[PDB]
RNA sequence: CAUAUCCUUAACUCAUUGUCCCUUUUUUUU
């Protein structure tokens, strides 16, 4: 039911955004058009880490 | 220029007892207007009369003589046609008029 | 209050009447509970000066001595405009104070 | 659990007072429809923005904000489901 | 001259375990006569008994004077229980049915 | 007997009388059923859950059977025989019956030694681990925490119940760190316990009749902290929680009755109205007044949180109900408790109300037409002034009735019509005005406690019309008023006393000050206390009303005198004498001249006797007669009396001394310090050490005293002094009062404008060492007070030294007071953002948590200072320290990140706000998705408007068009 | 005040007290086992993941527990 | 997971009087 990556990639105009997770969204091709949309800035890195911030 | 705040539509009463101010949707509000013994202007507090998912054309206040004020108004409702997915219920809703009456005795604005 | 998590608003058009402190409340700010700069009157909405309670404390309760305003910073913000702000509920905190003493006394 | 219920009913208390919040589940279409009738109000509210598309348009200005008014029910198109 | 909480119902701690019924029915039988005796099987309530008076005094009275006895060589706990809530519906039809044939007995509406 | 009878909290059950024992009898009922639940599917046979027919036969059936009782009775209770299968139903199912025996028919000693035993030693009566006391009448809800058992062995479900009442022993007996962390776990585990478990444990504790009322309070609130968690799980336990909390709405207690009111609004909201109503349905006509009373009360409640226009049709239908008169009844009580809870919200409604209470007055029960007549007036009440026009219909039987009924009728319906008078106009208003007078002067005799409780109010509300006429009312209504309502029995209930010297005073507005005042006046000397505090507020209220212009030389004497012997003879201890006296004389204003000589010799001689309460007094009344002494411009005698209260600072009783300080402040105020005797060098240095005095009155009055004499008057002290008073103050921080620190903070800045900030600041930074937070946070207030108001280019530096201590609150306050300095200097602050820039990033950067949440605090309010100024570099600098600890989840380092950016919204701009969270809202986590999307609704709440130009370019799709073509539009 | 000393300051005692428990336990601390961070707080150096403890009367407990011991034999 | 403790945060508060009158075949007498 899903993309995978390549699709996804070849899909957006900007494919140098897309990421692993990005196709567990539930609507990816707005998520990567937003992702390469100018003067964003991304989701800070450490949502994903296990450990605490600054910890 | 807020899409729910009022000041958009702004009728009077045609003998000048209330001012009904109104959003473009689902927002209005009346205001009784009078004049104390100084002949100052008195303004009371607001009266509202809410309707969600409503859209307004225009208001209009209705010269009834010296009855409860009225007021009229162009109305829409887009509850049903945003859970249509076929879309037909966006092509077969239809614009009412429907009349406000301020109930100068209670105090309230009833559609 | 901003120190209370379970008071809630009134929040509902407000009128002509003007919301007043009581001595206990008097030079704060109703919204975010500050000692400086107040910018603008509080307005409260009908049913909350209904009748004996007209003239109470907006943020406790109390025979009001002074008006109420908002500060400077929450006129900026525009928090002035989000509604009535007199608190409709007295809260855990206040329940909890009644009976502690109470049960001493 | 709970949290997740909480944060549910209060997201759906803002929604009806402000209409066009949003939470973690709106999808492409609630934002798009939300944004399209903002801007038609906001269109409609600002005199030199109307005085523009009126101009850009050949048409009168009563016209210009009756055809915005028509596009306020569906503005994006048929609900997606 | 009663306390509204006193009932014929009477909860007992510290119960000696395997105690006989006979000798149960003599402890508490002298107060008055005894409605019924429940003992406890399952082994979280093991060790404790409730026992009905037919007579609200005599309950008052096996209150008042059995706690703190010694049975087997241990100071028996007397309560009054609370009998604060129902376990099972009321079943209408038998009350029904047995109303009906009180009032065709009487005739009395 | 017990002798610690003293000292034991009393019961619940103490206070109750006859009636309110019938909650006692309630026992919790068997399994309901939820109709709605599985999306109200088929309902399961054979499952034993009673539905609504059930219940309603069973109820059916009892009032058959009482009937059929009642008969039997004049033919020839825990008494009555108790059937085999009926009383399986009152015990629990661990239990086996036993066969009684054949054998049972139902109808000194000397010196003996001892066998050694352990078996009294293994006996143990109270619970193994860290549970608290259990204490004996417990024993039967607790008691399978006596036995011990491996977890192991038993049930789930056992292992579940077991938990749930280990929790319930913490929150009710526990220390308050016990009690804290039960309560938190039993609110966070409440779904995964389930919604049954809970309840059919914790209904049978509040159902026990040896419960302290805040043992009561604290089940309660489990119950509401529960009730937020299970929001639709608590549907089958709707009527069992409201017959153990609708006893509450009657309670002689208010804050219990509150809280009832409001869990009864939240389980409202939690149920909604279809599950109400029908739980609600069956106690309508219920056999007992105890039940119906308190749903026609609960009622009330479901309909401030539900909304009228909700319940109307129910409402409707319960008032027109024929077969019984019970439930047409209890439906007018509906209205009527709906009139008294919601006031103003009734109005919209108010046609629909009494056209469902009109057929009431016409009925033929009596209790029905008194109910209606009640509800009439509490509709009437709560209308002010408006729904004349609605009432019309009800005017003609009340009328009707007024004229025909005499007895108890009457009450009820003149209630309703003087509650009428004021909503109608003048025309109908003198008409009607003028019958019920008369028929009020036939009232005044009867000795009918109802009937003076209703005739002093509609006197009241006669009297403010205009029909009437001052020589009327002074010719008629005004001799017997004060012959039959003016007695001593009326002053000792509270409500009589109010409504009478409400009374009173209407009467004075129409009649004249004198003419009042001068039947009244000589009750000042009566000799039961009660009486003359009553006359005293009547006399207080009138002259604070009209003056006393009205009042001649005769009379005046009359009143002076009877004050002065009315404050002589108090023992109450309240402010009604003193609040007399003031407005009394403040009233007569340069009248009272010849006076003073002897009030100031009467208080001067009462400020030496035996009496703390007499001397306290004494000051009291100095305090409240100073001004009068000012416009009557004898500033000598006001000299000398500072010089007298003076020597009385020695005082050892700390309610004497802090009037003594309170009367001092109040001479300082009405003469000046430049004429003040004894000389403010005088005073000054007698005063510190009184603020050693740790008692909360005479803190509060000698801070006060102390903070004014420093602005205005500090060159009467050398500066060692205020430096030594300076740190005397750093004891007052630890006031429980927050006036009393509120005071010490704002005498920090006046001092540090004396002997400047650097020896202010030195000692207020080494303060913030200490480890108690209230210490600490006004420490970090009166540094930012000083920065203020000595410019913060002086108290900067050091402050920002001291963020290099290696002490973690020291770190924490230099931060919290530049949150606050920035906070107070607003605009101006604009000159150090530069400056501070880089310690907040700084303590942006940090590992601990809350270094994060107060360098958020100091941001938003930097932001809002800086606003218009063109300081956005700072801002969006700090905009990228601030925005990673969005993922925080501690609610106080969460909302201060919120805070913050708020802030950021109005002094970097929308724009900014909405490129930072474009690209998590869609993100694929829900934890990166709904923090996002609640930064973005605050973004969208706050500016609206101005997104319209900032938000994306989204490209059609397939069926759906997104762009926006008219601003692509070309000119 | 001067000549013979009144009252005390309980807020400043209570300071002194948390030093003179500092210098006693810190004795008993080589110097390498203990790191003190820029807030006054105190790393354990033992532990190859660095818990970081309140006070020194947390370090010590702390170095008595078992999860440290386990990790000094292998340094 | 299930238990104490230590540290910290929120200018967190220092009791309250605000028709509960509801109830008994019950009703102040020419
Ligand atoms: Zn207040
Ligand atoms: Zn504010
Ligand atoms: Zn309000
Ligand atoms: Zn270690």
């Given at each position: 039911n899903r993309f995978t990556v390549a699709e996804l990639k070849q899909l957006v105009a900007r494919p140098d955004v897309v990421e692993m997770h990005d196709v567990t969204a539930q609507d990816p091709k707005l998520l990567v058009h937003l992702k390469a949309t100018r003067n964003s800035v991304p989701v800070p890195r450490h949502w994903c880490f296990k450990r605490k911030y600054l910890q | 220029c807020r899409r729910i705040v009022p000041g958009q539509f702004l009728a009077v009463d045609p003998k000048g007892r209330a001012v009904m101010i109104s959003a473009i949707e689902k927002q209005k509000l009346v205001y009784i207007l009078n004049r104390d013994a100084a002949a100052r202007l008195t303004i009371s507090s607001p009266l509202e009369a809410h309707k969600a998912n409503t859209l307004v054309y225009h208001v209009v206040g209705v010269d009834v003589g010296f009855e409860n004020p009225m007021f009229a108004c162009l109305e829409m409702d887009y509850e049903e046609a945003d859970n249509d997915p076929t879309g037909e219920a966006a092509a077969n809703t239809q614009q009412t008029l429907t009349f406000y009456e301020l109930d100068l005795g209670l105090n309230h604005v009833v559609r | 209050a901003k120190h209370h998590p379970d008071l809630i608003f009134c929040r509902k058009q407000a009128g002509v009447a003007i919301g007043r402190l009581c001595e206990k409340c008097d030079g704060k700010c109703v919204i975010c509970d500050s000692y400086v700069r107040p910018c603008t009157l509080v307005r409260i909405c009908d049913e909350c000066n209904y009748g004996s309670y007209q003239g109470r404390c907006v943020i406790c309760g109390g025979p009001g001595v002074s008006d109420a305003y908002y500060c400077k910073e929450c006129t900026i913000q525009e928090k002035d405009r989000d509604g009535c702000p007199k608190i409709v509920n007295l809260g855990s905190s206040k329940t909890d104070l009644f009976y502690e003493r109470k049960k001493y006394g | 659990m709970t949290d997740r219920y909480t944060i549910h009913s209060q997201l759906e208390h803002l929604q009806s007072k402000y209409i066009g919040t949003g939470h973690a589940d709106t999808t492409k279409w609630e934002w798009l429809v939300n944004q399209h009738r903002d801007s038609y109000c906001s269109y409609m509210g600002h005199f030199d923005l109307l005085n523009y598309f009126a101009i850009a348009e050949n048409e009168s200005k009563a016209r210009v904000r009756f055809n915005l008014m028509e596009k306020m029910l569906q503005p994006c198109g048929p609900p997606a489901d | 001259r009663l306390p509204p909480e006193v009932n014929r119902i009477l909860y007992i701690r510290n119960l000696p375990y395997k105690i006989t019924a006979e000798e149960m029915y003599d402890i508490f039988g002298k107060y008055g006569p005894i409605r019924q005796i429940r003992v406890g099987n399952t082994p979280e309530t093991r060790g404790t008994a409730y026992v009905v008076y037919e007579d609200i005094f005599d309950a008052k009275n096996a209150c008042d004077h059995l706690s703190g006895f010694n049975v087997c060589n241990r100071y028996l706990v007397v309560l009054y229980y609370?009998?604060?809530?129902?376990?099972?519906?009321?079943?209408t039809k038998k009350k029904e049915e047995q109303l009906k044939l009180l009032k065709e007995k009487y005739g009395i509406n | 007997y017990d002798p610690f009878a003293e000292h034991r909290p009393p019961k619940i059950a103490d206070r109750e009388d006859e009636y309110k024992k019938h909650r006692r009898t309630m026992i919790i009922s068997p399994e309901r059923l939820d109709p709605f639940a599985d999306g109200g599917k088929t309902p399961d046979p054979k499952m034993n859950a009673r539905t609504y027919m059930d219940v309603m036969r069973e109820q059916h059936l009892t009032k058959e059977e009482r009937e059929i009782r009642q008969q039997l009775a004049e033919k020839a209770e825990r008494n009555r025989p108790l059937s085999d299968e009926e009383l399986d139903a009152m015990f629990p199912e661990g239990y086996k019956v036993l066969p009684p025996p054949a054998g049972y028919v139902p109808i000194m000693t000397g010196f003996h030694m001892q066998t050694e035993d352990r078996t009294m030693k293994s006996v143990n009566d109270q619970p193994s681990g860290n549970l608290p006391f259990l204490k004996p009448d417990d024993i039967q809800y607790?008691?399978?925490?006596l036995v011990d058992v491996d977890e192991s062995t038993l049930s789930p479900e056992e292992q579940k119940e077991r938990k749930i009442m280990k929790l319930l022993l913490k929150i009710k007996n526990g220390t308050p760190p016990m009690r804290k962390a039960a309560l938190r776990q039993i609110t966070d585990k409440a779904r995964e316990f389930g919604a049954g478990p809970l309840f059919n444990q914790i209904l049978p504790l509040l159902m026990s009749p040896t419960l302290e009322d805040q043992e009561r309070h604290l089940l309660v609130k489990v119950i509401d902290r529960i009730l937020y968690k299970l929001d639709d799980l608590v549907r089958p336990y709707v009527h069992k929680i409201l017959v153990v909390i609708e006893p509450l709405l009657i309670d002689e207690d208010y804050y219990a009755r509150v809280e009832g009111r409001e869990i009864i609004s939240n389980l409202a909201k939690a149920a909604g109205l279809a599950t109400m109503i029908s739980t609600m349905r069956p106690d309508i006509d219920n056999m007992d007044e105890y039940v119906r009373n308190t749903t026609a009360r609960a009622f009330a409640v479901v309909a401030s949180a539900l909304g009228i226009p909700s319940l109307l049709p129910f409402l409707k239908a319960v008032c027109k109900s024929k077969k019984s008169w019970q439930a047409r009844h209890t439906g007018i009580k509906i209205v009527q408790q709906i009139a008294i809870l919601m006031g103003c919200a009734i109005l919209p409604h108010l046609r629909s109300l009494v056209e469902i209470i009109?057929?009431?007055?016409?009925?033929?029960?009596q209790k029905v037409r008194t109910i209606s007549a009640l509800a009439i007036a509490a509709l009437a009440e709560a209308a002010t002034p408006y729904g004349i026009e609605s009432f019309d219909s009800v005017l003609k039987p009340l009328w009707k009735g007024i004229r025909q009924h005499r007895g108890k009728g009457l009450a009820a319906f003149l209630k309703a019509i003087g509650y009428l008078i004021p909503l109608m106009d003048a025309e109908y208003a003198n008409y009607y005005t003028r019958e019920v007078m008369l028929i009020l002067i036939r009232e005044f005799q009867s000795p009918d406690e109802e009937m003076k409780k209703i005739v002093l109010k509609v006197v009241k509300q006669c009297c403010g019309t205009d029909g009437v006429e001052a020589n009327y009312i002074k010719t008629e209504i005004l001799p017997p008023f004060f012959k039959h309502f003016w007695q001593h029995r009326m002053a000792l209930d509270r409500r009589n006393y109010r409504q009478l010297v409400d009374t009173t005073v209407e009467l004075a507005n129409k009649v004249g000050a004198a003419e009042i005042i001068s039947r009244i006046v000589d009750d000042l000397k009566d000799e039961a206390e009660q009486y003359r505090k009553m006359v005293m507020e009547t006399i207080e209220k009138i002259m604070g009303n009209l003056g006393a212009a009205d009042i001649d030389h005769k009379l005046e004497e009359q009143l002076i005198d009877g004050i002065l012997y009315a404050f002589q003879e108090q023992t109450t201890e309240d402010s009604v004498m003193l609040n007399g006296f003031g407005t009394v004389v403040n009233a007569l204003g340069k009248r009272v001249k010849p006076y003073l000589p002897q009030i100031c010799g009467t208080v001067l001689w009462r400020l030496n006797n035996k009496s703390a309460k007499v001397r306290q007094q004494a000051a009291d009344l100095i305090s409240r007669t100073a001004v009068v002494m000012k416009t009557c411009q004898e500033e000598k005698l006001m000299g000398h009396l500072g010089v007298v209260l003076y020597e009385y600072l020695g005082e050892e009783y700390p309610e004497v001394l802090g009037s003594i300080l309170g009367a001092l402040k109040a001479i300082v105020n009405v003469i000046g310090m430049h004429k003040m005797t004894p000389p403010i060098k005088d005073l000054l240095p007698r005063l510190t050490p009184i603020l050693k005095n740790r008692h909360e009155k005479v803190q509060e009055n000698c801070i006060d005293l102390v903070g004014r004499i420093a602005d205005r008057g500090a060159e009467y002290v050398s500066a060692r002094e205020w430096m030594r008073i300076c740190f005397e103050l750093l004891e007052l921080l630890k006031a429980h009062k927050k006036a009393i620190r509120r005071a010490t903070v704002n005498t920090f800045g006046y001092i540090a404008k004396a002997i400047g900030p650097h020896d202010v600041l030195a000692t207020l930074l080494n303060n913030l060492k200490v480890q108690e937070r209230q210490n600490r946070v006004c420490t970090t207030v009166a540094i930012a007070i000083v920065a203020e108001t000595c410019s913060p280019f002086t108290v900067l530096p050091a402050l920002m030294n001291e963020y290099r201590v290696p002490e973690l609150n020291v770190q924490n306050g230099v931060l919290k007071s530049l949150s606050f300095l920035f906070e107070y200097i607003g605009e101006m602050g604009k000159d150090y953002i530069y400056a501070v820039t880089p310690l907040l990033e700084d303590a942006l950067m940090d590992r601990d948590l809350v270094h994060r949440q107060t360098a958020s605090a100091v941001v938003q309010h930097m932001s809002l200072g800086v606003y218009?100024?063109?300081?956005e570099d700072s801002l969006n600098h700090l905009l990228n320290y601030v925005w990673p600890n969005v993922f925080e989840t501690s609610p106080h380092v969460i909302q201060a990140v919120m805070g913050a950016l708020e802030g950021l919204r109005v002094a970097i701009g929308p724009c900014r706000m909405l490129q930072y969270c474009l690209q998590g809202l869609?993100?694929?986590?829900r934890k990166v998705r709904d923090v996002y999307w609640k930064i973005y609704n605050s973004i969208y709440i706050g500016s609206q408007d101005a997104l319209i130009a900032h938000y994306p370019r989204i490209y059609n799709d397939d069926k759906n068009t997104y762009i926006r073509y008219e601003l692509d539009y070309i000119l | 005040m001067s000549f013979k000393r009144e009252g005390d300051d309980w807020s400043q005692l209570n300071v002194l007290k948390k030093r003179r428990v500092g210098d006693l336990l810190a004795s008993?601390?080589?110097?390498?086992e203990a790191l003190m961070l820029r807030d006054g707080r105190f790393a354990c150096a033992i532990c190859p993941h660095r818990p970081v403890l309140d006070t020194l009367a947390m370090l010590t407990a702390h170095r008595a527990g078992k999860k440290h011991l386990s990790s000094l034999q292998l340094f």
């Open positions: - | - | - | - | 609370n009998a604060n809530r129902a376990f099972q519906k009321m079943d | 607790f008691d399978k925490l009109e057929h009431g007055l016409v009925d033929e029960q218009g100024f063109g300081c869609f993100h694929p986590a | 008993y601390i080589p110097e390498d």
